[PDB]
């Protein structure tokens, strides 16, 4: 039941970079929302 | 801002002062009531008779005049609440 | 059938029935004279056929309401007073469960240390100098909307679910875990139980001591519940049979039961209150349709 | 702890995160913070 | 010393409309930052 297989792996890290949004909330409210911008643009629309 | 000091005096340090003022919160309200006979004659003419039309227009003018009086009362409540808060803030002149 | 469509039709029918109860169609001639604010108010024209709960505004000196200005939802008691200036005065269930005898000494002292001041001491002296309890102080309803000004404004619910406004955060009755007990063979039999308040007196050789009990049972019938409470209280009933003759104080019974209202079985949850750090175990009933029946005494 | 962010805010679907029932997990306290309500709690709305 | 003169005065209320950003932070962190888009667009620049 053992065979070598050719797999398509990652080779580097992912990235996560703040925006100005998350920087200001981290400064003033001690906190971070992940996906604050994608979150906000879908906040008021139908597809929440 | 500081001032440069002359001979034999310690120059003072860069004084930085941070304060925070909160918000007082204060509601106001006005009630007015309508009688049940006024509510009955406000919403329908039972038969289309002359007396019933008179009472329908009286009920309508009652509702309208009470709405205008209540809106005026909210304006004057804003007046009085703001004067209340300025008097609670204001220290008198000899102290000032 | 379609199913989804009929479901939307029923939901639209319920929303339109709520609007039919809420607003009123106007058959005034409705001429174009008025300003737009009066125009939109004459188009809407609310009436109070929407809340369907019955409340009462109440003024009480704020020295008496020590945990109850913070913890919304409490039983309240009307104490009439021979003072003309305030003819009635309002009382917390915990404020009266202080000198109730059911409460153990640790909980009693702990609550008292909440309730220690001059006003509350004088009122407890008045309550003790009263002869009986049940018709000098009385049941009044369930707490919502504490204001806490100078003289604190308390709303209080006579009938219906407990809420101020917006029909949000529907509060619940808070009963001290020690004072309540459920006499039935199967506790929490099938479904929603009726919550009662039982006042039971007792005589320790000198004076009468009252006890404040809260029972939860599946029985609706008051004859059935006093028949289960006699079986529960048959010993002390016997002691009062000896007391009530040699006494001369104007009372004629052992205790009395009165219905608060409905509850739900799954809406019973435990917890604790805390005021000034005193952790205090309670059984928090969650959603209560308040329904005061008459007092029914048993001897 | 606030739960109304979970109650309201945008969510990302996840397929077959639990192969097993979460009834046992809720009833026997696998978790550190959990908030459960059967009837629909209207307290999601008082956004102060 | 007492005169009666014409003064340019306001006649309406000032407005303020909550942003989508402030709505998201009000749901998440129980807070509103006023002027939030200014704190965003003036953060990483020279003119903080």
Write the DSSP assignment of C114-145 as a string of letters: HS-SHHHHHHHHHHHHSS-STTTEEEEEEEEE
Of B43, B64, B68, the CB nearest to C27: B43
How far is the C-alpha of C228 from the C-alpha of C184, rounded, in Å? Answer: 7
Sign of torsion over alpha carbons B32, B38, B44, B50: negative
Chains touching D, CB cut-off 8 Å, 3+ pairs: A, C, E
Q: Give Cβ neighbours of residue C277 (< 8 Å, ≥ 6 apart).
A: none
How far is the C-alpha of C45 from the C-alpha of C30, rounded, in Å? Answer: 13
How far is the C-alpha of C287 from the C-alpha of D38, rounded, in Å? Answer: 13
Residues of A with Cβ-Cβ distance to E43 under 8 angstroms = 20, 23-24
* 8 A C-beta contact, residue C281 and residue C270: yes
Grouping H, G, I as helix, E, B as strand and the rest as coil, residue B53 is: helix
The total number of residues written for chain A in this structure: 48
Question: Which residues is chain A interrupted after (C–N above 2.5 Å)?
Answer: none
DSSP-assigned letter for residue C184: S
Contact check, Cβ <8 Å, A21/E21: yes
Q: How many CB atoms within 10 Å of residue C59? A: 15
Q: Give the nearest chain E residue to D44 (CA atoms).
A: E27
Report the 3 state secondary structure along chain A. CCCCCCCCCCCCCCCCCCCHHHHHHHHHHCCCCCCHHHHHHCCCCCCC
What Å distances lie between residue D23 and C167, D7, D29, D40, CA to CA? 30, 20, 10, 18
* 8 A C-beta contact, residue C61 and residue C151: yes
Q: Which of C58, C41, C95 is nearest to C275 (CA)?
A: C95
Contact check, Cβ <8 Å, D9/A39: yes
In chain C, beta strands by DSSP E: 54-61, 75-80, 88-92, 137-146, 151-160, 174-176, 194-203, 208-217, 255-262, 268-275, 278-285, 290-291, 296-298
How far is the C-alpha of C98 from the C-alpha of C107, rounded, in Å? Answer: 9
Burial class of C169 by CB neighbour count within 10 A (0 to 12, 13 to 18, 19+): middle
* 8 A C-beta contact, residue C226 and residue C159: no
Q: What DSSP string runs through C89-104? A: EEEEHHHHHSS-SSS-
Name the minimum distance, in Å, from the CA of E42 to any CA of chain A: 9
Q: Which two tokens mark A45?
A: 């629309």
What Å distances lie between residue A1 and A4, A5, B45, C53, C54, CA to CA? 10, 12, 90, 71, 75
Q: Which two tokens mark A6?
A: 């050719």
Residues of C with Cβ-Cβ distance to D45 under 8 angstroms = 166, 168
Q: Could you tell me how far CA B47 lies from the centroid of its own chain?
A: 43
How far is the C-alpha of D12 from the C-alpha of C289, rounded, in Å? Answer: 39
How far is the C-alpha of C194 from the C-alpha of C163, rounded, in Å? Answer: 20
Report the 3 state secondary structure along C202-265. EECCCCEEEEEEEEEECCCCHHHHHHHHHHHCHHHHHHHHHHHHHCCCCCCCCEEEEEEEECCC
CA angle B14, B18, B23 (to 5 degrees): 165
What's the alpha-carbon Rg for chain C, to the nearest Å?
Answer: 23
Q: What are φ and ψ of residue C143, in 5° steps? A: -80, 135
Grouping H, G, I as helix, E, B as strand and the rest as coil, residue E44 is: coil
Q: Which two tokens mark C279?
A: 């952790």
Q: Could you tell me how far CA C24 lies from the centroid of its own chain?
A: 34
* 8 A C-beta contact, residue C94 and residue C108: no
Burial class of D19 by CB neighbour count within 10 A (0 to 12, 13 to 18, 19+): exposed
Q: Which two tokens mark C203?
A: 């005589």
Q: Which of A37, D35, D5 is nearest to E28 (CA)?
A: D5
What's the alpha-carbon Rg for chain E, to the nearest Å?
Answer: 19
How far is the C-alpha of C280 from the C-alpha of C273, rounded, in Å? Answer: 5
What per-residue string of b and e applies to A2-39 under the rule 16 or more CB within 10 Å gives b? eeeeeeeeeeeeeeeeeebbbebbeeeeeeebeebeeb
What Å distances lie between residue C251 and A24, B15, C36, C245, CA to CA? 71, 75, 64, 10
Q: Which of C196, C215, C183 is nearest to C258 (CA)?
A: C196
Residues of E with Cβ-Cβ distance to D43 under 8 angstroms = none
Sign of torsion over alpha carbons C156, C161, C163, C165: negative
How far is the C-alpha of B26 from the C-alpha of B89, rounded, in Å? Answer: 15
* 8 A C-beta contact, residue C108 and residue C96: no
Residues of A with Cβ-Cβ distance to E23 under 8 angstroms = 43-44
Q: Give Cβ neighbours of residue C51 (< 8 Å, ≥ 6 apart).
A: C160, C165, C167
How far is the C-alpha of E13 from the C-alpha of C60, rounded, in Å? Answer: 39
Q: How many CB atoms within 10 Å of residue D11? A: 8
CA angle B84, B85, B88 (to 5 degrees): 90
Q: Which of B64, E36, B18, B94 is nearest to C29 (CA)?
A: B64
How far is the C-alpha of C109 from the C-alpha of C126, rounded, in Å? Answer: 20
State the greatest distance between any 2 C-alpha atoms of chain B, in Å, as a whole number. 102
Q: How many CB atoms within 10 Å of residue C77? A: 20
Q: Given the structure tokens 């000034």, which residue do they identify?
A: C276
Grouping H, G, I as helix, E, B as strand and the rest as coil, residue B29 is: coil
Q: Which two tokens mark A43?
A: 């906040």
What's the alpha-carbon Rg for chain D, to the nearest Å?
Answer: 13
* 8 A C-beta contact, residue C179 and residue C282: no
How far is the C-alpha of E19 from the C-alpha of E32, rounded, in Å? Answer: 10
What Å distances lie between residue B87 and B78, B80, B82, B92, B94, CA to CA? 14, 10, 9, 10, 15
Q: What are φ and ψ of residue A31, in 5° steps? A: -150, 160
Sign of torsion over alpha carbons C276, C277, C281, C286: positive
- Bridge partners of C76, per DSSP, are C92, C141
Q: How many CB atoms within 10 Å of residue B83? A: 10
What helix, strand, coil percent values describe chain E, rounded to 5? Answer: 30, 0, 70
Q: What are φ and ψ of residue C227, in 5° steps? A: -70, -30
Q: Give the nearest chain A residue to D12 (CA atoms).
A: A48
The total number of residues written for chain B in this structure: 96
How far is the C-alpha of B55 from the C-alpha of B35, rounded, in Å? Answer: 13
CA angle C179, C184, C190 (to 5 degrees): 110
Residues of E with Cβ-Cβ distance to D47 under 8 angstroms = 26-27, 30
Chain D contact for E28, CB < 8 A? Answer: yes
To the nearest 10°, report the CA torsion of C211, C214, C218, C222: 50
Strands C208-217 and C268-275: unpaired
Strand order in the sheet with C278-285: C174-176, C278-285, C268-275
């Amino acid at each position: 039941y053992i065979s070598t297989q050719v797999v398509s792996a990652p080779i580097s890290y992912g990235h996560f970079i703040m925006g100005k949004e998350n920087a200001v909330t981290a400064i003033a409210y001690r906190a971070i929302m992940a996906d604050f911008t994608q979150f906000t643009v879908n906040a008021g629309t139908e597809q929440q | 801002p500081r001032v440069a000091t002359g001979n034999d005096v310690t120059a003072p340090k860069e004084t930085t002062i941070m304060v925070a003022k909160h918000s007082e919160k204060h509601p106001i309200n006005i009630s007015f009531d309508l009688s049940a006979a006024c509510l009955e004659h406000l919403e329908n003419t039972f038969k289309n008779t002359v007396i019933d039309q008179i009472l329908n227009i009286n009920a309508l003018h009652t509702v309208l005049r009470s709405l205008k009086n209540s809106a005026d009362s909210l304006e004057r409540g804003l007046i009085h609440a703001f004067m209340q808060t300025l008097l609670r803030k204001s220290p008198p002149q000899f102290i000032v | 059938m379609n199913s989804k469509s009929s479901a939307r039709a029923a939901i639209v029918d319920t929303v339109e029935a709520v609007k039919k109860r809420k607003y009123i169609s106007i058959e005034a001639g409705t001429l174009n004279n008025v300003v737009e604010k009066e125009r939109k108010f004459l188009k809407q024209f609310l009436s109070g056929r929407e809340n369907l709960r019955i409340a009462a505004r109440v003024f009480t000196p704020c020295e008496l309401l020590a945990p109850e200005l913070e913890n919304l939802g409490m039983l309240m008691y009307r104490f009439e007073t021979d003072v003309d200036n305030p003819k009635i005065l309002f009382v917390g269930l915990f404020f009266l469960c202080s000198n109730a005898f059911n409460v153990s000494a640790c909980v009693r002292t702990a609550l008292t240390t909440m309730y220690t001041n001059s006003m509350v001491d004088n009122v407890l002296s008045m309550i003790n100098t009263c002869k009986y309890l049940e018709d000098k102080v009385s049941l009044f309803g369930v707490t919502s909307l504490v204001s806490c000004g100078s003289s604190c404004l308390l709303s209080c619910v006579m009938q219906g679910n407990v809420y101020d406004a917006n029909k949000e955060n529907i509060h619940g009755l808070t009963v001290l875990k020690e004072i309540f007990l459920e006499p039935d063979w199967e506790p929490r039999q099938h479904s929603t139980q009726y919550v009662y308040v039982v006042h039971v007196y007792k005589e320790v050789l000198s004076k009468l001591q009252y006890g404040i009990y809260v029972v939860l049972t599946s029985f609706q019938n008051e004859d059935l519940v006093v028949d289960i409470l006699r079986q529960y209280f048959e010993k002390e009933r016997f002691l009062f049979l000896n007391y009530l003759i040699n006494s001369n104080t104007t009372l004629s019974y052992f205790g009395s039961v009165q219905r608060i209202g409905r509850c739900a079985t799954e809406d019973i949850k435990s917890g604790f209150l805390q005021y000034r750090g005193i952790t205090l175990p309670v059984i928090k009933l969650e959603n209560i349709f308040v329904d005061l029946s008459e007092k029914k005494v048993f001897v | 702890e606030n739960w109304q962010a979970t109650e309201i805010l945008p969510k990302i679907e996840a397929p077959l995160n639990i192969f097993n029932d979460i009834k046992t997990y809720t009833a026997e306290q696998l978790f550190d913070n959990l908030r459960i309500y059967f009837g629909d709690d209207p307290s999601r709305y008082n956004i102060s």
